[PDB]
Amino acid sequence: KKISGGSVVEMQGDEMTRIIWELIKEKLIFPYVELDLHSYDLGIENRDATNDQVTKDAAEAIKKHNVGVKCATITPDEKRVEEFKLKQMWKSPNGTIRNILGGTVFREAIICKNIPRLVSGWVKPIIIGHHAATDFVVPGPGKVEITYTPSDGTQKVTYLVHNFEEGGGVAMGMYNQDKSIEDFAHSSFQMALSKGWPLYLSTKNTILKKYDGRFKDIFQEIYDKQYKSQFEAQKIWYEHRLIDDMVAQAMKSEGGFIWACKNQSDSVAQGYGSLGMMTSVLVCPDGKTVEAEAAHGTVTRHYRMYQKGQETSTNPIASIFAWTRGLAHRAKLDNNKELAFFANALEEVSIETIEAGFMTKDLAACIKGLPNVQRSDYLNTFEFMDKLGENLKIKLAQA
Amino acid sequence: KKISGGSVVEMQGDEMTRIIWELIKEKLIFPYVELDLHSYDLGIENRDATNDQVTKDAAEAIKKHNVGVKCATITPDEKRVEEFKLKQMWKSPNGTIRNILGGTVFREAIICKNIPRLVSGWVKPIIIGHHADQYRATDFVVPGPGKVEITYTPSDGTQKVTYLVHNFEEGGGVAMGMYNQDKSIEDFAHSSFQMALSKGWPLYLSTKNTILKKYDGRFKDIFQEIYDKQYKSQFEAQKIWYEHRLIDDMVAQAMKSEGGFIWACKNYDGDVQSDSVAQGYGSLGMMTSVLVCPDGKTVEAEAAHGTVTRHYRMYQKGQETSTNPIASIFAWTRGLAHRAKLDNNKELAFFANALEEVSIETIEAGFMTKDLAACIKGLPNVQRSDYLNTFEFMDKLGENLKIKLAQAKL
Ligand SMILES: NC(=O)C1=CN([C@@H]2O[C@H](COP(=O)(O)OP(=O)(O)OC[C@H]3O[C@@H](n4cnc5c(N)ncnc54)[C@H](OP(=O)(O)O)[C@@H]3O)[C@@H](O)[C@H]2O)C=CC1
Ligand SMILES: NC(=O)C1=CN([C@@H]2O[C@H](COP(=O)(O)OP(=O)(O)OC[C@H]3O[C@@H](n4cnc5c(N)ncnc54)[C@H](OP(=O)(O)O)[C@@H]3O)[C@@H](O)[C@H]2O)C=CC1
Ligand SMILES: Cc1cc([C@H](C)Nc2nccc(N3C(=O)OC[C@@H]3[C@H](C)F)n2)ncc1-c1ccnc(C(F)(F)F)c1
Ligand SMILES: Cc1cc([C@H](C)Nc2nccc(N3C(=O)OC[C@@H]3[C@H](C)F)n2)ncc1-c1ccnc(C(F)(F)F)c1
Ligand SMILES: Cc1cc([C@H](C)Nc2nccc(N3C(=O)OC[C@@H]3[C@H](C)F)n2)ncc1-c1ccnc(C(F)(F)F)c1
């Protein structure tokens, strides 16, 4: 008989990840967990048919139920508008969800001992969260100034940005509200306590002494009053770092830390060919609400090959870890030891399978190099899923 | 009876690099090349004793003679004035020289087969370009509610234009203004296009003009309209090209590339994205930098690292050091190669190339300093039998350079 998993918000997506998403639910989730499943179809056609209302409804559902797991979605461009005859170029579902939920996105790579790392000393995962303007054209010579006028009008400060003396150019003003900085701190501290890992904040406060110093000051202030004892209880710590020193410290580290960045990771994973092993999680500052997803997109290029009949080796691990992280967080909110056990076991099974030599083409290329990858070096998407299912069944049986 | 080098402005420096610098001239340059040297001592003693006038003097000579090579110089902080009992926390000579000559700084790592690269697919060097943007920004604290505006006031008395940045309705925060000039973007473009044709590699500019449509669009439009008019004809002769890339597309593209291209970066923190990574990876001694002025003629070449203070203390205390000179050598060779380009000096162009190849081949033959041995075996895992010290390595280079030049007379 199956585990009671509780309230989970699920969002269905597009193209290749949609296929893998259902495979995950059929093969890996539903045979072992029963869910009070709040399910929303963020497929592109249904977003068009509902005028993006389903996107907003999914976000309020995550807000209500604290656990969202999301499949990758097409963000419409002009060519997508014609492909599906869209009513309009709908806004990114991801931007809509985070706008409604707030919080900070943290990315984490999944490490297998048989898989090379970009920096080989990184033997434990590193978790990175980023904090997330008015620009214009200067037609010609003249002063660009930026002014602050307090609501009392008691004073007024006019800062010189630049006096253009030879021709024109460009200029911009940008800002941050304290509250958004504070939320960034709380999410970062909540992430470190949840993971049991130390936390570092990197800034350029040597250069942006006021702008970035505010990030350092608000992080330290919130830490001292609200998290320092909770950190000491888990024997973790928080420290600010100049970005220069953080880069060097990280490259000489073995991993296992949170890195809050004040200035993204998925582009480096894509260059390295490890996007299928990179998970993503949006952490709201309340410490209660989480939205988990893969860091990659719908993998359109693999989906076209699948549509034309050709065989596909798309990596499902990041999509799988979206479910494990969501369910693990659901278990923590509910004190569900059986669900917590299942979520961890599925992560172990995923890593053990790869470390036993059964992997998708991307992983094999990471070991050998793609110009040396023969077809027997890897499994296709569906073989790999079957293999994970066999190994998951065994792991759960052997207990 | 030697190779005629021509007019080169030199800039002497501080501590371990200065020691390296002299070995390079005595062992690698002077025995084969005679130069119209214009030497300036930017050692911090001579900067103090001349009230840092030698620094500004050295810059104009570069503008006069168009080729300069610079040894690493101490930047004065509050702790240096106590060590050197200085009379001022002078500017770093780098910022002085740069704002005088202007132009774009290009970074290039020196690649050896047996020395691993951060991305193994990189078999050819990648050159990063960036104008010499967060450093010229005005930031401040918003202490409480109120309005932040950014305004443009024309110098001809016409109507000022006001842009709202943000209305802080409750609480405060931070705000800042940034800027870039068309003239600097235009120099950036020309310097990049001229670097690509000189090296014979394609060129990419990366912006995020999807987000900063006006700020970064100006970068993209200016590069494109200079390319379409003044360089696309030359670019297609050498089978190369220029193209704009979104920054996140470009990161992935560069990591999948084999190297051998020029990357012009709008938002570039060179101390972070280049030096710090090389510092963490352990290859700062293999990183070179050259300032390319927009005139198409004036360059200043230098190592991308500093005076290596830690090694110098070890050398002062009597201990053996193993300091990598390659980046300092390639400051010379890149300056000489540019001098030969201007003077059509085949004999000097050959010497610069030969010195670059002897440096690379010596390492690929297994003779290297401590840092390069660490890149192979791991930073904490070097034995003394794995490397040569500073002077042992310079001797090995000198011996291989003599043999290389002898075999060239056939
Ligand atoms: N959070 C979200 O919902 C996101 C959605 N998208 C959307 O996805 C669509 C396609 O985006 P695209 O630019 O192709 O980015 P994708 O991440 O979808 O694909 C980029 C490339 O990375 C590799 N890759 C990505 N995921 C995997 C995987 N699971 N297994 C193996 N390889 C993988 C593939 O490279 P190779 O070709 O070398 O195999 C793929 O072609 C777009 O419409 C975009 O809007 C994009 C990002 C995020
Ligand atoms: N262009 C210029 O004039 C610059 C000057 N400086 C100046 O140099 C001084 C020291 O700066 P610092 O922070 O030490 O920067 P350095 O580049 O001098 O040293 C940084 C570290 O990187 C390694 N390293 C650097 N160069 C080499 C090399 N050629 N061979 C082997 N290893 C190398 C050393 O690591 P390890 O200790 O592990 O051996 C060194 O401690 C300061 O006074 C600063 O102002 C700094 C930057 C630029
Ligand atoms: C530290 C870090 C970690 C991660 C991911 C989220 N976490 C992680 N954890 C363990 C391994 C690992 N990765 C690996 O080994 O290769 C692929 C993937 C990685 C994409 F490279 N990624 N993303 C970027 C950085 C990073 C950001 C800025 N600067 C640097 C540097 F200083 F190094 F330049 C590194
Ligand atoms: C160190 C670094 C920092 C930055 C920017 C100015 N600052 C920053 N600070 C923190 C994180 C962060 N990045 C993140 O998280 O992902 C995207 C971006 C980064 C692409 F990683 N970028 N740009 C490039 C590099 C870099 C240069 C060469 N090699 C690598 C690597 F080794 F990673 F391949 C990384
Ligand atoms: C492409 C690149 C090249 C260089 C240097 C001037 N050129 C170079 N050429 C060959 C090898 C080589 N390096 C190597 O092998 O290790 C150390 C050093 C490098 C520091 F990694 N550096 N600096 C930074 C980047 C870069 C900048 C921003 N973003 C990324 C990335 F997209 F990767 F994140 C990479």
Coordinates of C-alpha atoms in Angstrom, one line a residue, chain B residues 190-352:
Chain B
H190 CA 37.6 49.6 -33.7
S191 CA 40.1 48.1 -31.3
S192 CA 38.1 44.9 -31.3
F193 CA 37.8 44.8 -35.1
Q194 CA 41.5 45.5 -35.5
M195 CA 42.5 42.9 -33.0
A196 CA 40.4 40.3 -34.9
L197 CA 42.0 41.0 -38.3
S198 CA 45.5 41.2 -36.8
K199 CA 45.1 37.8 -35.1
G200 CA 43.0 36.4 -38.0
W201 CA 40.2 35.2 -35.6
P202 CA 36.5 36.0 -35.6
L203 CA 35.0 38.4 -33.2
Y204 CA 31.9 38.3 -30.9
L205 CA 30.3 41.1 -28.9
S206 CA 28.1 40.1 -26.0
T207 CA 25.4 42.3 -24.5
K208 CA 22.0 41.8 -22.8
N209 CA 20.2 44.2 -25.2
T210 CA 17.0 42.2 -24.6
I211 CA 16.8 43.6 -21.1
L212 CA 18.7 46.9 -21.4
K213 CA 17.3 47.7 -24.8
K214 CA 18.6 51.3 -25.0
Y215 CA 21.8 51.0 -23.0
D216 CA 23.1 47.8 -24.5
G217 CA 21.4 48.3 -27.9
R218 CA 23.7 51.3 -28.4
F219 CA 26.7 49.0 -27.9
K220 CA 25.3 46.6 -30.5
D221 CA 24.2 49.2 -33.0
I222 CA 27.6 51.0 -32.9
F223 CA 29.6 47.8 -33.4
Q224 CA 27.3 46.8 -36.2
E225 CA 27.4 50.1 -38.1
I226 CA 31.2 50.3 -37.9
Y227 CA 31.5 46.7 -39.0
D228 CA 29.2 47.1 -42.0
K229 CA 31.1 50.2 -43.2
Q230 CA 34.8 49.8 -42.3
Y231 CA 35.6 46.1 -41.7
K232 CA 33.2 43.6 -43.2
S233 CA 35.1 43.7 -46.4
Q234 CA 38.4 43.0 -44.7
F235 CA 36.8 40.4 -42.4
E236 CA 35.5 38.3 -45.3
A237 CA 38.9 38.3 -47.0
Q238 CA 40.4 36.4 -44.1
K239 CA 37.4 34.0 -43.9
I240 CA 36.4 35.4 -40.5
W241 CA 33.4 37.3 -39.3
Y242 CA 31.8 39.4 -36.5
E243 CA 28.5 38.7 -34.8
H244 CA 26.6 39.9 -31.8
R245 CA 25.6 37.4 -29.1
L246 CA 23.4 37.5 -26.0
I247 CA 25.7 37.1 -23.0
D248 CA 24.1 33.8 -21.8
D249 CA 24.2 32.3 -25.3
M250 CA 27.8 33.4 -25.5
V251 CA 28.9 31.8 -22.2
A252 CA 27.6 28.4 -23.5
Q253 CA 29.0 29.0 -27.0
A254 CA 32.5 29.8 -25.6
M255 CA 32.5 26.8 -23.4
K256 CA 31.7 24.5 -26.4
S257 CA 34.3 26.3 -28.6
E258 CA 37.8 25.2 -29.2
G259 CA 39.0 28.7 -28.7
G260 CA 40.7 31.0 -31.2
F261 CA 38.3 33.9 -31.2
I262 CA 38.0 37.4 -29.7
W263 CA 35.2 38.0 -27.2
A264 CA 34.3 41.7 -26.6
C265 CA 32.5 41.9 -23.3
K266 CA 30.3 44.9 -22.4
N267 CA 29.8 44.0 -18.7
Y268 CA 33.3 42.7 -17.8
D269 CA 34.9 42.6 -14.4
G270 CA 38.3 41.5 -15.5
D271 CA 39.6 41.1 -12.0
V272 CA 36.8 38.6 -11.4
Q273 CA 36.0 36.8 -14.7
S274 CA 39.6 36.5 -15.8
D275 CA 42.2 37.1 -13.1
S276 CA 40.4 35.6 -10.1
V277 CA 39.5 32.4 -12.0
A278 CA 43.0 32.1 -13.3
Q279 CA 44.2 32.8 -9.7
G280 CA 41.9 30.0 -8.4
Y281 CA 42.8 27.8 -11.3
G282 CA 46.5 28.6 -10.8
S283 CA 47.4 30.1 -14.1
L284 CA 48.0 33.9 -13.5
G285 CA 51.6 33.4 -14.6
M286 CA 50.2 32.4 -18.1
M287 CA 47.9 35.4 -18.5
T288 CA 48.9 38.4 -20.6
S289 CA 47.3 41.7 -21.2
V290 CA 47.7 44.5 -23.8
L291 CA 46.1 47.9 -24.0
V292 CA 45.1 48.7 -27.6
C293 CA 44.4 52.4 -28.4
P294 CA 41.8 53.3 -31.0
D295 CA 44.4 55.0 -33.3
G296 CA 45.3 51.5 -34.5
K297 CA 49.0 52.1 -33.7
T298 CA 49.6 52.6 -29.9
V299 CA 49.7 49.6 -27.6
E300 CA 51.0 48.9 -24.1
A301 CA 51.7 45.3 -23.2
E302 CA 52.1 43.8 -19.7
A303 CA 51.6 40.7 -17.6
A304 CA 48.1 40.4 -16.1
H305 CA 49.5 39.5 -12.7
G306 CA 51.1 41.7 -10.1
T307 CA 54.5 42.1 -8.5
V308 CA 54.1 38.7 -6.7
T309 CA 54.9 40.1 -3.3
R310 CA 54.8 36.7 -1.5
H311 CA 57.5 35.3 -3.7
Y312 CA 59.6 38.5 -3.3
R313 CA 59.6 38.2 0.5
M314 CA 60.7 34.5 0.1
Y315 CA 63.5 35.8 -2.1
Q316 CA 64.5 38.5 0.4
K317 CA 64.6 36.0 3.2
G318 CA 67.1 33.9 1.3
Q319 CA 64.8 31.1 0.1
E320 CA 64.4 29.5 -3.3
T321 CA 61.5 30.8 -5.4
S322 CA 59.8 29.4 -8.5
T323 CA 58.1 32.4 -10.1
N324 CA 56.6 32.1 -13.6
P325 CA 58.0 34.6 -16.1
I326 CA 56.0 33.6 -19.2
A327 CA 53.4 36.4 -18.8
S328 CA 56.3 39.0 -18.4
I329 CA 58.0 37.5 -21.5
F330 CA 54.9 37.7 -23.5
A331 CA 54.6 41.4 -22.6
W332 CA 57.9 41.8 -24.4
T333 CA 57.1 39.6 -27.4
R334 CA 53.7 41.2 -27.9
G335 CA 55.2 44.7 -27.8
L336 CA 58.0 43.6 -30.2
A337 CA 55.5 41.9 -32.5
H338 CA 53.6 45.2 -32.7
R339 CA 56.8 47.1 -33.2
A340 CA 57.7 44.8 -36.1
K341 CA 54.2 45.2 -37.6
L342 CA 54.6 49.0 -37.7
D343 CA 58.2 48.9 -39.0
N344 CA 57.7 46.0 -41.5
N345 CA 60.6 44.4 -39.6
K346 CA 60.6 40.7 -40.6
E347 CA 63.6 39.9 -38.5
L348 CA 62.0 41.3 -35.4
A349 CA 58.6 39.7 -36.1
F350 CA 60.5 36.4 -36.4
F351 CA 62.3 36.9 -33.0
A352 CA 59.1 37.7 -31.1

